[PDB]
Every structure is written in C-alpha cells, then in structure tokens.
C-alpha cells in the first residue's frame, strides 16, 4: 500500500526493530553490542547508538546486513530519536588541495540521546544486567557453532 518512492517505505526485517540490541559484525566496532535507534528513511541504514559510555560506540549508521539483532530488546519509546535525521551524517564537500574532532551539534545530539538511552536502560527491570550485556564483547571462540545458536 505504501509507495515504494516514499521516505516511509521499508523492507527491513522485524528482528532489527527499534530498541533491540544488535551485535556489530564489521567495521571499527566489530564485536561490540549496541542499541538500534531507528532506520533512516528511504529504506536506509540503521542508526545505532549503543551508549558510548558503555562500549564506546557513538551514534553511527550501519547497514542491517552487518549486524545481528538479538531478541533482547529495550523499551526506548522515551528516547526522542527525532533529531537524528539523514542531514546529521551528511558532510560538506572538501575543496581541492590528539582528541578526536567532533562538531558541537554532534556532541549535543550524542549527549541527549545517550542520556535518554541510559535512563531507559535503568528503567528496565533487568537494566543493570543489560548494561553489563552492552559492555560485553562478542567474539568467535574455538569450538563455537554460531549457526546452531538462538539469538
């Protein structure tokens, strides 16, 4: 029913729902657990901000194919997630030719989102255990059979 050209159209699988906890399978933060916040419009990539305080993962977009969305979720209806738009990750063109540099607006968005995400985790009955879950690092051990596991 929804138009395929609309920003609201999506095909994302159900497991990668907002609030779910995802395992990062690739990139700089491989093996880290993170929290799925939203999907960018036009069937875009997911946006994960598994709190940087817990594991160092900032507000970053990631393709859903490079993540394992576990069945363990967190109610994040209290998180706004509205200011996280496609414009946040856009970058100006570079013309023809040590603490990390983060723009002030990006820093404020990270501050507000993480604070609300942490508060929602605290509100959870298993929040302290889930906070430790977010700190845990996933790795493939000798003898592991990931193809046989439930997630």
């Amino acid at each position: 029913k929804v138009s395929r050209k609309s920003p609201e159209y999506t095909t994302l699988r159900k497991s990668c729902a907002p609030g779910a906890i995802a395992i990062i399978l690739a990139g700089r933060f491989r093996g880290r657990r993170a929290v799925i916040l939203k999907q960018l419009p036009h069937n875009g990539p997911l946006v994960v901000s598994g709190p940087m305080k817990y594991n160092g993962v900032p507000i970053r977009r990631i393709d859903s194919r490079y993540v394992i969305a576990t069945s363990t979720t967190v109610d994040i209806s209290s998180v706004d997630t509205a200011p996280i738009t496609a414009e946040v990750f856009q970058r100006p063109k570079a013309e023809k030719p040590k603490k990390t540099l983060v723009s002030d607006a990006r820093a404020q968005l990270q501050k507000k989102i993480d604070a609300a995400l942490i508060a929602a985790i605290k509100k959870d009955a298993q929040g302290k255990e889930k906070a430790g879950y977010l700190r845990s690092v996933f790795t493939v051990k000798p003898g592991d059979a990931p193809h046989r596991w439930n997630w």
């Binding site: 000798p142 003898g143 592991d144 059979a145 193809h147 046989r148």
Partner: protein
C-alpha cells in the same frame, strides 16, 4: 577439476544443515605478496 568453484571446510560445520546457514556469507583468503601495493583506504588509513 573445475577451478571456478572452490570447496571450503569450516570448523564446527559438519552437517549439510549447518552449511546451509552459511549460504551467501562473505569468504576471504588472506596472504601476502613481496611488495607493498595499493589497498583499500591507502590514502585515508596509511597504517593499512
């Protein structure tokens, strides 16, 4: 032999059902040459 198709044995994968789970997954063979040649993020990440 037909070299266009490779056969890979993966540890802890001993059933056909187990191998079905890995269909479509990315596979990488790592080796080294003699000289340092161009790679991904050659300019962005010189440490690579």
């Amino acid at each position: 032999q037909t070299k266009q198709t490779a056969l890979v044995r993966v540890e802890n994968v001993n059933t056909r059902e187990d191998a079905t789970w890995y269909v479509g997954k990315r596979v990488c063979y790592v080796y080294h040459g003699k000289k340092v040649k161009r790679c991904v993020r050659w300019s962005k990440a010189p440490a690579r």
